[PDB]
């Protein structure tokens, strides 16, 4: 589980992100689509060229979900439940894909917040996203 130091690191890291959550979400998605093209095939109804309205709208929503998680660290299984239903039962996301969005987010955060992204913040953020994915892959098993 996330330690009290993790909880402060994550909250603080996401604090800096602040208003820019949505932009970073859209960037993370784009870094995921390009770097791992298989992931594109979950979004065949999207126009996935750089700057597209649908990627931008989706990025805003992924961001809002992670912001909501950052408020509720002592309960990620609970507050993300309804999302684990969607991803697994409806969309059927291969469980391997989640680590990819996680990686892409880390690269995004690192790009924009170099002086915040110490090794220990890197670590707690990874832990935070490992926690999220897990919940999101919950509804297999």
């Amino acid at each position: 589980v996330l330690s009290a130091a993790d909880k402060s690191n994550v909250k603080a890291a996401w604090g800096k992100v602040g208003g820019n959550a949505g932009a970073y979400g859209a960037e993370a998605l784009e870094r995921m689509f390009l770097s791992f093209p298989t992931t594109k095939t979950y979004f065949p109804h999207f126009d996935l060229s750089h700057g597209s309205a649908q990627v931008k709208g989706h990025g805003e929503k992924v961001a809002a979900a992670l912001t909501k998680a950052v408020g509720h660290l002592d309960d990620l299984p609970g507050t993300l439940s309804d999302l684990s239903d969607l991803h697994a039962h409806k969309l059927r996301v291969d469980p391997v894909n989640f680590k990819l969005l996680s990686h892409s987010l880390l690269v995004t955060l690192a790009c924009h917040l170099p002086n915040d992204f110490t090794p220990a913040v890197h670590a707690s953020l990874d832990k935070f996203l490992a926690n999220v994915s897990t919940v999101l892959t919950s509804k297999y098993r």
Partner: protein, 145 residues
């Protein structure tokens, strides 16, 4: 591996990378973020906290060794397999590092390039480096097939 223009995009970026310091940091972050990997480096001394790992002089020495072999790969991208022959045999038929961990260090390194270079390390450039680390991962893994 890559096309003759992709290779150029990559070689053009890497010439700006400070490989020694990316190396020290990347091995560092790996050990901090993914603790099970520390097992392979118990003989490097104290690794008992983030600061301990990051300031470990041997972790920094080895970091550089890992990145120098990287840079070297960059120079032999058409034949990554043959270039990593001995190290593929070292990690597998001796160190027994599971191939998954190649991918991880690769990703940690790409995280470090992002931190070191910011918006210069574009999505497009990243994806190009993403298949380099995959390629390096394939060559070190190869001795398992």
């Amino acid at each position: 591996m890559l096309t003759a223009e992709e290779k150029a995009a990559v070689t053009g970026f890497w010439g700006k990378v400070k490989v020694d310091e990316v190396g020290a940091e990347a091995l560092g972050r790996l050990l901090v973020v993914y603790p099970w990997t520390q097992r392979f480096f118990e003989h490097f001394g104290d690794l008992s906290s983030a600061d301990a790992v990051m300031n470990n002089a041997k972790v920094k020495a080895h970091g550089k060794k890992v990145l120098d072999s990287f840079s070297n790969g960059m120079k032999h991208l058409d034949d990554l397999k043959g270039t990593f022959a001995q190290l593929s045999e070292l990690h597998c038929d001796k160190l027994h590092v599971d191939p998954e961990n190649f991918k991880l260090l690769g990703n940690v390194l790409v995280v470090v390039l992002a931190r070191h270079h910011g918006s210069e390390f574009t999505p497009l450039l990243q994806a190009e480096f993403q298949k380099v680390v995959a390629g390096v991962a394939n060559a070190l893994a190869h001795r398992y097939h």
